[PDB]
Design an enzyme around this catalytic site. Structure first.
Site, mmCIF file in Angstrom:
data_model
loop_
_atom_site.group_PDB
_atom_site.id
_atom_site.type_symbol
_atom_site.label_atom_id
_atom_site.label_comp_id
_atom_site.label_asym_id
_atom_site.label_seq_id
_atom_site.Cartn_x
_atom_site.Cartn_y
_atom_site.Cartn_z
ATOM 1 N N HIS A 58 -10.338 -3.282 10.195
ATOM 2 C CA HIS A 58 -10.050 -3.121 8.623
ATOM 3 C C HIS A 58 -10.773 -4.366 7.864
ATOM 4 O O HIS A 58 -11.345 -4.404 6.921
ATOM 5 C CB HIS A 58 -8.596 -2.762 8.046
ATOM 6 C CG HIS A 58 -8.261 -1.672 7.959
ATOM 7 N ND1 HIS A 58 -8.903 -0.527 6.983
ATOM 8 C CD2 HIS A 58 -7.016 -0.718 8.310
ATOM 9 C CE1 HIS A 58 -8.164 0.369 6.920
ATOM 10 N NE2 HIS A 58 -7.178 0.392 8.034
ATOM 11 N N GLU B 220 0.829 -1.157 0.021
ATOM 12 C CA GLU B 220 0.010 -0.100 0.071
ATOM 13 C C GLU B 220 0.895 1.169 -0.021
ATOM 14 O O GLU B 220 1.898 1.355 0.859
ATOM 15 C CB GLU B 220 -0.790 0.216 1.374
ATOM 16 C CG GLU B 220 -1.816 1.124 1.241
ATOM 17 C CD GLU B 220 -3.062 0.776 2.273
ATOM 18 O OE1 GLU B 220 -3.170 -0.180 2.794
ATOM 19 O OE2 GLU B 220 -3.921 1.968 2.335
ATOM 20 N N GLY C 223 2.772 2.523 11.214
ATOM 21 C CA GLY C 223 2.465 1.683 12.330
ATOM 22 C C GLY C 223 2.183 0.412 12.241
ATOM 23 O O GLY C 223 2.670 -0.335 12.580
ATOM 24 N N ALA C 224 1.594 0.060 11.159
ATOM 25 C CA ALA C 224 0.855 -1.246 10.629
ATOM 26 C C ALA C 224 0.346 -1.392 9.606
ATOM 27 O O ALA C 224 -0.088 -0.285 8.906
ATOM 28 C CB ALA C 224 0.155 -2.106 11.721
ATOM 29 N N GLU D 209 -2.768 -3.651 7.283
ATOM 30 C CA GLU D 209 -3.680 -4.796 7.071
ATOM 31 C C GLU D 209 -3.792 -5.516 5.719
ATOM 32 O O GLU D 209 -3.549 -4.836 4.780
ATOM 33 C CB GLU D 209 -5.184 -4.253 7.454
ATOM 34 C CG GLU D 209 -5.788 -3.640 6.160
ATOM 35 C CD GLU D 209 -5.614 -2.289 5.618
ATOM 36 O OE1 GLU D 209 -4.775 -1.550 6.184
ATOM 37 O OE2 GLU D 209 -6.274 -1.725 4.640
ATOM 38 N N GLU E 225 -10.144 4.792 5.929
ATOM 39 C CA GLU E 225 -9.388 5.001 7.225
ATOM 40 C C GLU E 225 -9.909 5.961 8.120
ATOM 41 O O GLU E 225 -9.702 5.419 9.167
ATOM 42 C CB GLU E 225 -7.972 5.753 6.613
ATOM 43 C CG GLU E 225 -6.973 4.785 5.741
ATOM 44 C CD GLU E 225 -6.836 3.744 6.240
ATOM 45 O OE1 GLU E 225 -6.747 3.813 7.483
ATOM 46 O OE2 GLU E 225 -6.414 2.763 5.804
ATOM 47 N N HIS F 192 -7.020 -1.293 15.308
ATOM 48 C CA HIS F 192 -7.261 -0.576 13.882
ATOM 49 C C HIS F 192 -7.111 -1.554 12.771
ATOM 50 O O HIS F 192 -7.987 -1.502 11.798
ATOM 51 C CB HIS F 192 -5.996 0.414 13.914
ATOM 52 C CG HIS F 192 -6.137 1.115 12.360
ATOM 53 N ND1 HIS F 192 -6.818 2.720 12.473
ATOM 54 C CD2 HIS F 192 -5.854 0.964 11.199
ATOM 55 C CE1 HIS F 192 -6.582 3.057 11.198
ATOM 56 N NE2 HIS F 192 -5.913 1.940 10.253
ATOM 57 N N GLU F 193 -5.957 -2.368 12.660
ATOM 58 C CA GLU F 193 -5.870 -3.457 11.508
ATOM 59 C C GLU F 193 -6.838 -4.274 11.512
ATOM 60 O O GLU F 193 -7.412 -5.049 10.601
ATOM 61 C CB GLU F 193 -4.320 -3.713 11.719
ATOM 62 C CG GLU F 193 -3.263 -2.924 11.918
ATOM 63 C CD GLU F 193 -3.301 -2.059 10.738
ATOM 64 O OE1 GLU F 193 -3.961 -1.990 9.569
ATOM 65 O OE2 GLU F 193 -2.610 -0.678 11.000
HETATM 66 C C1 LIG Z 1 -0.803 3.928 13.472
HETATM 67 C C2 LIG Z 1 -1.546 4.261 12.153
HETATM 68 C C3 LIG Z 1 -3.086 3.679 12.619
HETATM 69 C C4 LIG Z 1 -1.784 5.688 11.787
HETATM 70 C C5 LIG Z 1 -1.128 3.376 11.029
HETATM 71 O O1 LIG Z 1 -0.153 2.725 10.988
HETATM 72 N N1 LIG Z 1 -1.962 3.658 9.909
HETATM 73 C C6 LIG Z 1 -1.767 2.836 8.547
HETATM 74 C C7 LIG Z 1 -3.039 1.991 8.267
HETATM 75 O O2 LIG Z 1 -3.874 2.660 7.653
HETATM 76 N N2 LIG Z 1 -3.017 0.564 8.499
HETATM 77 O O3 LIG Z 1 -3.871 0.171 8.154
HETATM 78 C C8 LIG Z 1 -1.034 3.328 7.708
HETATM 79 C C9 LIG Z 1 -0.507 4.627 7.747
HETATM 80 C C10 LIG Z 1 0.128 5.131 6.672
HETATM 81 C C11 LIG Z 1 0.227 4.518 5.663
HETATM 82 N N3 LIG Z 1 0.880 5.220 4.416
HETATM 83 C C12 LIG Z 1 1.590 6.417 4.327
HETATM 84 C C13 LIG Z 1 2.090 6.326 3.057
HETATM 85 C C14 LIG Z 1 1.537 5.490 2.529
HETATM 86 N N4 LIG Z 1 0.964 4.742 3.298
HETATM 87 C C15 LIG Z 1 -0.065 3.192 5.259
HETATM 88 C C16 LIG Z 1 -0.879 2.650 6.466
HETATM 89 ZN ZN LIG Z 2 -5.895 1.884 8.117
#
Ligand SMILES: CC(C)(C)C(=O)N[C@@H](C(=O)NO)c1ccc(-n2cccn2)cc1
Ligand SMILES: [Zn+2]
Length: 889
Positions: free
Chosen positions: A305, A124, A265-266, A268, A324, A301-302
């Site tokens: 999803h 992603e 962070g992580a 899915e 998101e 969070h994951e």
């Molecule tokens: C910690 C947090 C919830 C903010 C996180 O890791 N969000 C993920 C996410 O939506 N995981 O399902 C996330 C954050 C940024 C990106 N991203 C940043 C640039 C390209 N992708 C991808 C995933």
């Molecule tokens: Zn997410």
């Protein structure tokens, strides 16, 4: 520089039905064989077949088992594979290729890459094109059959999406695993993991279908003992979605994997979730308290999803906030329920009004659904995520629980197994809105402005009370400042959760009420109001707006003391502080500008200080809330209210105010720090990794906050308490002893001590780096140079680099040194980082986001550094676009 526009969405002229992957991992290269069973779509117009493909070394490509030649039949420019239409079949055909990639030297951490001794993927948003050729867009749904092979000694554990259907040996000490994943999915949800992974496991039995689900959490062998909390959080997440939303997990197995090198962070991926190690691993001996809320939210969070992701995919990346924003909202509901502490909601509001509000008034300002982008990696913002969640949350506020959970079901049913948009979600909530109001003419068309309109709305109030009539009026006005996205801002649908407090006994005067503001201004009238009330406005922070309550400090103090809503109490305190800060700021500024030999400062409100003492000494009050009221508003929150901010003057303002309050309450602070010790540092469950007490952690937060205040003020013999604090088994405590010892000669001694405690745990060392980085030291620049030479070195680990530099950028007095040395330092770090990790380089640009809000000299200094960065010949597209937009060029 190509720019994609939301209004230009058109379905692909091609279809990918089946993906068959063979990923062969070797020491110095990885061979990817791919067969795509394709077809022609109804939107086709005889165009060239164009695949996304970045940095792929072509061994061979084909169509229907016949090799294509370069120049005549196709061209490849390391970004796009163009197969000329005359060589493209008219009906169902098979495209195949064999490319070579190199996960070992993939330091950008996107696509397939190596993190320590683990091969892992991150696709992603546009990472799959870095693995093999594909029409890399989320609306291209396909079936996946994936085979992975590698050396068994180095990579005994192989994982990918779906079910593992075959395991086999290979001559030469190698092996393979085949994974079949029949349900359709977009390519960004593809994942693969190879490594010497150890695990903790468990079986979860679902609520309704009684389905048994295998739960696995993975990490490198060294840290397998830090996996327990993650497993517990996963169980909690599954139970919550079952109890609140009534949804069960759809698959029979769920894998969580920790890796050391991760950009965010992580992630899915259907059944296979991949995590930054700092967001999955913890132990009470090797982690600070914050890790526990962090792991809970990120695992949650994951997980959340999954359900929606299994039924509805984004049509395009412009709808990112739909998945998101909604997931962060579900995540926040989960966390609030799990922690059962009011500071959970407060912390989210704290983050929004500091970080996101800054972004929304910066040149980078954008709606939660933008109209265009150049790089998708710059799309994942606090606006899309956190303002998005607030927009998703407002649906629940307006509709209430019953009708919200109902409009949620409508969304799922109406959009099942196809691609959706934000308007599809609004439509479903609109159907619930009609049903709630019991009138089918009701609509939520204005609500769509929350998706398309950028900037933070301002909501102001005026009041009137007629004693004889017992009639109370609240006059509300809303305003949004024009920007580059809209010349004329429209009024939004703003839900205002309110109560009326009787000032002479603190009781509620009216039932639960949510004002629906839909015009630029309105007057809300209440009859049978026996006495003049104090308005409790935007309870729970019910809209993402600037609140101008127009209350006196006396009225705000009574809310702070007697209101029933945590946020309004917290906001009332915030407002009292802000009024004081702006007043003292201007006084200090005038002194500086006029070169005054003498001048006066307005003292902090004595009744306010009395109110703080009252709350702190209340044993029935919440420890978490208490730590908030003795802390001034964040600098990034403050800056939204001051033009041409002199950072030195603000630093002087904060110092004066803290000292004013300290000179009155320091004895109370010390008394509490001592009396909280027993319960806060209780060791009863220190070796139970599944026992987490968020109230107890809040007590430690209060203690460490008070210790900081007491250390700064040089409270008599506080160094004794600091030294004894360093001997505490809790990392939150003994890392605090480090930072508060900055104001003493014993700093470098605790520096060495805490280093030895931290150095043999990867994540703990990073927390140590953060602590050092944030230390209030006059020699912080020499200290930073020490970190670079002795600990950080040439590490490409994003956690390492972010830990050393980001906390320092929050040092108001030092990072913003008038020589520009701080700006120069971070710019050098950004440029260096951009050579191997463009995403992290952009993350390191964070302090520059407020460049045009500072004083004229500091504006010029920052702008100079950004222009210098922009002129780097080898600058990435990611950093370039980011800096171009930030500098308004
Ligand atoms: C910690 C947090 C919830 C903010 C996180 O890791 N969000 C993920 C996410 O939506 N995981 O399902 C996330 C954050 C940024 C990106 N991203 C940043 C640039 C390209 N992708 C991808 C995933
Ligand atoms: Zn997410």
């Amino acid at each position: 520089p190509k720019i994609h526009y939301r209004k230009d969405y058109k379905p692909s002229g091609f279809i990918i039905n089946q993906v068959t992957l063979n990923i062969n991992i070797h020491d110095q290269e990885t061979i990817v064989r791919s067969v795509l069973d394709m077809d022609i779509s109804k939107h086709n117009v005889g165009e060239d077949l164009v695949f996304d493909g970045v940095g792929l070394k072509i061994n061979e490509i084909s169509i229907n088992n016949k090799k294509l030649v370069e120049g005549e039949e196709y061209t490849y420019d390391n970004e796009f594979l163009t197969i000329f239409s005359k060589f493209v079949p008219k009906s169902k055909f098979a495209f195949s290729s064999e490319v070579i990639i190199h996960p070992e030297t993939n330091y950008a951490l996107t696509g397939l890459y190596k993190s320590k001794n683990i091969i892992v993927s991150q696709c992603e948003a546009t990472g799959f094109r870095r693995i093999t050729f594909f029409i890399d867009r989320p609306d291209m749904m396909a079936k996946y059959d994936v085979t992975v092979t590698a050396d068994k000694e180095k990579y005994p554990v192989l994982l990918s999406n779906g079910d593992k259907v075959n395991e086999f040996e290979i001559p030469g000490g190698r092996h393979g695993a085949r994974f079949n994943d029949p349900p359709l999915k977009p390519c960004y949800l593809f994942a693969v993991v190879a490594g010497d992974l150890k695990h903790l496991s468990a079986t979860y039995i679902t609520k309704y279908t009684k389905k048994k689900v295998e739960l696995y959490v993975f990490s490198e062998e060294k840290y397998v003992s830090k996996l327990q909390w993650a497993l517990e959080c996963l169980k909690k997440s599954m139970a919550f979605d079952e109890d609140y939303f009534g949804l069960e997990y759809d698959l029979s197995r769920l894998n969580l994997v920790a890796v050391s090198d991760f950009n965010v962070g992580a992630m899915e991926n259907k059944g296979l979730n991949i995590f930054n190690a700092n967001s999955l691993l913890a132990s009470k001996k090797n982690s600070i308290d914050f890790s526990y809320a962090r792991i809970l939210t990120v695992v949650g969070h994951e997980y959340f999803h999954q359900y929606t992701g299994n039924r509805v995919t984004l049509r395009d990346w412009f709808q990112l906030t739909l998945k998101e924003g909604l997931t962060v909202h579900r995540e926040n509901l989960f966390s609030e329920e799990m922690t059962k502490t009011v500071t959970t909601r407060l912390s989210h509001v704290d983050l929004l009004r500091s970080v996101q509000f800054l972004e929304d008034s910066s040149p980078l300002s954008h709606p939660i659904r933008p109209e265009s982008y150049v790089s998708m990696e710059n799309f994942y913002t606090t606006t899309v995520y956190d303002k998005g969640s607030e927009v998703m949350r407002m649906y629940l506020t307006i509709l209430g629980e019953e009708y919200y959970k109902k409009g949620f079901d409508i969304y799922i049913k109406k959009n099942d197994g196809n691609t959706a948009t934000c308007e599809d979600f609004n439509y479903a909530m609109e159907q619930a809105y009609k049903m709630k109001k019991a009138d089918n003419s009701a609509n939520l068309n204005q609500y769509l402005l929350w998706f398309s309109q950028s900037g933070t709305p301002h909501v102001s109030f005026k009041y009137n009370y007629d004693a004889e009539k017992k009639q109370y009026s609240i006059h509300v006005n809303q305003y949004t400042k024009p920007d580059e996205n809209q010349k004329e801002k429209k009024p939004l649908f703003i839900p205002i959760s309110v109560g009326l407090i009787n000032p002479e006994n603190g009781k509620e005067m009216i039932s639960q009420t949510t004002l629906e503001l839909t015009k630029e201004s309105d007057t809300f009238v209440f009859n049978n109001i026996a006495v003049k009330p104090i308005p409790s406005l935007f309870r729970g922070f019910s809209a993402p707006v600037y609140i101008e309550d127009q209350l006196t400090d006396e009225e705000r103090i009574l809310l702070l003391k007697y209101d029933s809503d945590a946020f309004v109490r917290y906001n009332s305190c915030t407002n009292i502080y802000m009024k004081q800060i702006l007043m003292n700021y201007n006084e200090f500024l005038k002194a500086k500008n006029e070169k005054l030999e003498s001048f006066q400062l307005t003292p902090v409100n004595a009744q306010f200080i009395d109110a703080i003492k009252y709350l702190l000494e209340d044993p029935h009050a919440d420890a978490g809330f208490k730590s908030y009221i003795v802390s001034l508003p964040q600098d990034r929150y403050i800056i939204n209210f001051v033009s041409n901010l002199d950072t030195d003057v603000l630093a002087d303002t904060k110092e004066y105010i803290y000292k004013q309050i300290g000179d009155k309450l320091n004895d109370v602070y010390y008394k509490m720090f001592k009396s909280l010790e027993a319960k806060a540092d209780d060791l009863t469950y220190f070796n139970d990794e599944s026992h987490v007490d968020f109230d107890q952690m809040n007590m430690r937060t209060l203690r460490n906050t008070l210790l900081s205040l007491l250390s700064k003020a040089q409270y008599p013999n506080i160094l004794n308490e600091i030294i004894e604090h360093s001997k505490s088994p809790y990392p939150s405590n003994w890392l605090t002893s480090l930072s508060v010892s900055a104001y003493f000669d014993k700093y470098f001694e605790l520096y060495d001590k805490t280093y030895k405690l931290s150095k043999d745990d990867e994540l703990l060392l990073q927390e140590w780096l953060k602590t050092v980085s944030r230390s209030d030291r006059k020699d912080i620049y020499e200290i930073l140079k020490k970190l670079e030479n002795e600990v950080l070195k040439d590490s490409k680990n994003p956690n390492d680099i972010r830990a050393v530099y980001l906390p320092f950028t929050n040092n108001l007095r030092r990072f913003h040194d008038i020589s520009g040395k701080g700006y120069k330092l971070i710019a050098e770090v950004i440029t260096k980082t951009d050579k191997f990790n463009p995403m992290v380089a952009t993350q390191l640009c964070e302090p520059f986001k407020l460049w045009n809000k500072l004083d004229t000299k500091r504006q010029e200094l920052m702008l100079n550094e950004m222009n210098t960065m922009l002129q780097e010949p080898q600058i990435s597209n990611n950093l370039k676009e980011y800096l171009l937009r930030l500098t308004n060029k």
